[PDB]
Amino acid sequence: GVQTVTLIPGDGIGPEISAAVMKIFDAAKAPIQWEERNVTAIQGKWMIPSEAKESMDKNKMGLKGPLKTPHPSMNLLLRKTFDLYANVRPCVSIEGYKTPYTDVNIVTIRENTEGEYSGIEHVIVDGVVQSIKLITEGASKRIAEFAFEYARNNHRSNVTAVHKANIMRMSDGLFLQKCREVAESCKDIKFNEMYLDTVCLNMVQDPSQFDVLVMPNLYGDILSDLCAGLIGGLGVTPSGNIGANGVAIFESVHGTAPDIAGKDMANPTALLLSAVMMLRHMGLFDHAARIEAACFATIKDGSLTKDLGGNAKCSDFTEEICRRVKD
Amino acid sequence: GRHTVTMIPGDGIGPELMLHVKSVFRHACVPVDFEEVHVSSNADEEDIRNAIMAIRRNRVALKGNIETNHNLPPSHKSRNNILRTSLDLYANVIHCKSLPGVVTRHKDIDILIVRENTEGEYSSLEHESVAGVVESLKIITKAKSLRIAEYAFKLAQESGRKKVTAVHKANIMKLGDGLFLQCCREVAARYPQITFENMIVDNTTMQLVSRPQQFDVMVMPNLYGNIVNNVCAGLVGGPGLVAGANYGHVYAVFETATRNTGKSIANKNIANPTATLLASCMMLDHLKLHSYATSIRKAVLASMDNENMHTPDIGGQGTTSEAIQDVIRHIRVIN
Ligand SMILES: [Mg+2]
């Protein structure tokens, strides 16, 4: 039967690209019905409207477009309210779209609760600023357990913990400590540890060696963006946030792009591929596989959006995929 | 009229490469004397305090890399990082320039990365005052952000480069990186001939992979764990090619851009010497021995044009000694 997914179209290109995914999901005749909520901030005591929370709490699956950043970030409010603690970014090379890196196929799993997010920053005396971050024993264990769980289910064979335990001796030491615990209980997956800089050094040189990477949020999404740089950028990268209660919201990392907002120039590839992720999380694999293949095929051919150097339009690009899916 | 400089063999491929520096130096007739000081892997500080006293005496040092152990107690702070803070070597400079001989995915790269080297991650203070919760406390200051920015622009101006790019995370860390970014702006005013731009570190990593030719000089605070340094090393060929330097008001310490000791390849006569050699060249320029440095540097770059002299790390099949042999060959020609 049809399952229902909370849709949060974003701002700028957000509604436009949301529209495009729905159109393709329709051409794909996939058992999905979109319960649209447009959530904006309300109250400090900031919160998302109850109607949006309950929608997400019920459906468990969210798909969202880019959100303008204005008090507390909406993204922040979402993360906190559904306890999204695992960020997944699978970076795989695109056959139609040539970059200096072609062999790329990685999943970056990052802690999504602490580090930068839990940070407090303040002035100590004039011209001296101090930054405060934290890592907990509980949260490192959780993300590690997720990392191996994701590797096992998604037919992945290696998990690498990325740390900087030379400098963050205590914090990254505790992170490794938990990753080791979990590796002991999950010997199906080959586990190693690397320093962040060596990973970056090697990533640039030969990303083919890496499979699945797990890390804490002391450094943010810098490394995942490094990987996105490898496969053509933020226009084509799916993102997923998995939380407590079986909630999972899939999103696009690329910004709003307001200067282009009208005229449907925008590239809906990233959001679409995120939905493909969503379909697989749901277990609608056939549908995920078809929509994905159509999207890859459409790019390989060239009907390309301007950012991909096509002169084609969002509608056409969407239209072209739609047409392909039907066969 | 010979200089005396401290040499630190260090661990891994360090010592063996240091011997090749000596032999090259003797053959180039360079007026330098190396006063060796060792740093092992015991807890006892005096191993590291002795080197301080030695470097304070000579004011210039060349070193290999010290083995790091992230399984030791938090009381055991990094030897190399103690060395930098104690001697106040605030400016870390790394030149990531493409080598014509070395084949990579990107060409025409010429980046001067200047990084704060006394605060930020070196100031880190961790405590577990409640069981299972580790908190960290970093510091960034106006005084140290100005000097590193003052150094970059001065290096930019004197090197004849056009642009300095500040790399930060001031979108997330309003107060900290915002202060650094503002300290760079204050300096930018006194250097009208230099173009000043800034960029988020997230975006900077992505650009490096796609279009690294856009970067000229880069200045940054000591955060993000040398992501930029290593991405750029990987870009031009790897850790065997890039040299690093640490400048203070008084002292100066020269080394490879990487901290890798190369334990697995040590004593096998296969390590790439060019990183250490170019570092020794930078050391010679600092000692005002500009003729000797140009001779050695040119010899290194020339032998690198030949793929037969390449070592296994960059795909070649030559040995270290064989590489040094061709280096010395080019020096004897121009003499
Ligand atoms: Mg980011």
From Swiss-Prot, chain A:
Keyword rRNA-binding set for record: no
Cellular compartments annotated: Mitochondrion
Effect noted on mutating M168I: In RP90; uncertain significance
This protein's record includes keyword Phosphoprotein: yes
Subunit structure: Heterooligomer of subunits alpha (IDH3A), beta (IDH3B), and gamma (IDH3G) in the apparent ratio of 2:1:1. The heterodimer containing one IDH3A and one IDH3B subunit and the heterodimer containing one IDH3A and one IDH3G subunit assemble into a heterotetramer (which contains two subunits of IDH3A, one of IDH3B and one of IDH3G) and further into the heterooctamer.
Family: Belongs to the isocitrate and isopropylmalate dehydrogenases family.
Descriptive protein name: Isocitrate dehydrogenase [NAD] subunit alpha, mitochondrial
Species whose genome carries this gene: Homo sapiens (Human)
UniProtKB/Swiss-Prot annotation, chain B:
Subcellular location, principal: mitochondrion
Cofactor note: Divalent metal cations; Mn(2+) or Mg(2+). Activity higher in presence of Mn(2+) than of Mg(2+). Binds 1 Mg(2+) or Mn(2+) ion per subunit.
Biological process annotations from GO: carbohydrate metabolic process; isocitrate metabolic process; tricarboxylic acid cycle
Regulation: The heterotetramer and the heterodimer composed of IDH3A and IDH3G subunits can be allosterically activated by citrate (CIT) or/and ADP, and the two activators can act independently or synergistically. The heterodimer composed of IDH3A and IDH3B subunits cannot be allosterically regulated and the allosteric regulation of the heterotetramer is through the IDH3G subunit and not the IDH3B subunit.
Annotated GO CC locations: isocitrate dehydrogenase complex (NAD+); mitochondrial matrix; mitochondrion; nucleolus
Domain of life: Eukaryota
SMART domains with a match to the protein in the record: Iso_dh (SM01329)
Record note on what altering T68A does: Significantly impairs the activation of the heterodimer composed of IDH3A and IDH3G subunits by citrate
Subcellular location: Mitochondrion
Sites where the protein binds Mn(2+): D202
Pfam families (UniProt xref): Iso_dh
Entry's family note: Belongs to the isocitrate and isopropylmalate dehydrogenases family.
Known partners and oligomeric status: Heterooligomer of subunits alpha (IDH3A), beta (IDH3B), and gamma (IDH3G) in the apparent ratio of 2:1:1. The heterodimer containing one IDH3A and one IDH3B subunit and the heterodimer containing one IDH3A and one IDH3G subunit assemble into a heterotetramer (which contains two subunits of IDH3A, one of IDH3B and one of IDH3G) and further into the heterooctamer.
Name used for this protein in its record: Isocitrate dehydrogenase [NAD] subunit gamma, mitochondrial
Species for this entry: Homo sapiens
Record gene name: IDH3G
